[PDB]
Design a protein around this ligand. Structure first.
Ligand code: A1AOC
Length: 167
């Protein structure tokens, strides 16, 4: 858990302008969070990038998990292998408000982080999931009680998130 160059926002939330994949390779954290969907199909965005960094091992493991257990619910999670990226991957399904899912489920999604002492994570439901990224950061700060290191791969968004928190 050798995180470097993060800005501490609260006693348990840290943030950096960085690619989560590159952070996971450098830090080798105990847990890396994936911004998953309910069938664990890692077809693009953060999930596709994490799966590609495992050379598709994450997708094969995910298909086997779904075969035995069925899909997740929106706001839910599962713990699978971290492969070369972490000891464990916490696959968390935030709501996709561009597809009509309820933004209130973003609190349930962040509540999954509280079962793990230290996590490397992306900003849930942001990007093409359509949630307001400043609201996602507020829900993270208000909900997560364990130690979370957020990697946000966009300097323009990073700067707007830090400015909004420090208001
Ligand atoms: C808001 C943006 C900046 C953020 N992106 C990222 N945040 C952190 N590490 C990242 N690595 C890459 C990457 C690495 N290689 N490739 C080709 C992509 C993206 C990226 C983000 C945050 C949450 C979500 C998404 C995107 S999403 O659009 O994938 C939908 C799921 C929720």
């Amino acid at each position: 858990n050798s995180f470097s160059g993060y800005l501490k926002l609260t006693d348990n939330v840290y943030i950096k302008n960085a690619d989560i994949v590159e952070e996971a390779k450098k830090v080798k954290p105990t847990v890396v969070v994936n911004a998953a969907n309910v069938y664990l199909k890692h077809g693009g965005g953060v999930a596709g990038a994490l799966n590609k960094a495992t050379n598709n091992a994450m997708q094969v493991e995910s298909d086997d998990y779904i075969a035995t257990n069925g899909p997740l619910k929106v706001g839910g999670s599962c713990v699978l292998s971290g492969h070369n990226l972490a000891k464990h991957c916490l696959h968390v399904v935030g709501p996709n408000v561009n597809k009509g899912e309820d933004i209130q489920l973003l609190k349930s999604a962040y509540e999954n982080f509280n079962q793990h002492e230290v996590l490397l994570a992306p900003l849930l439901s942001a990007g093409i999931f359509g949630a307001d990224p400043i609201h996602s950061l507020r829900v993270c700060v208000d909900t997560v009680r364990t130690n979370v290191y957020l990697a946000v791969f966009d300097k323009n968004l990073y700067d707007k998130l830090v400015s909004s928190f420090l208001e």
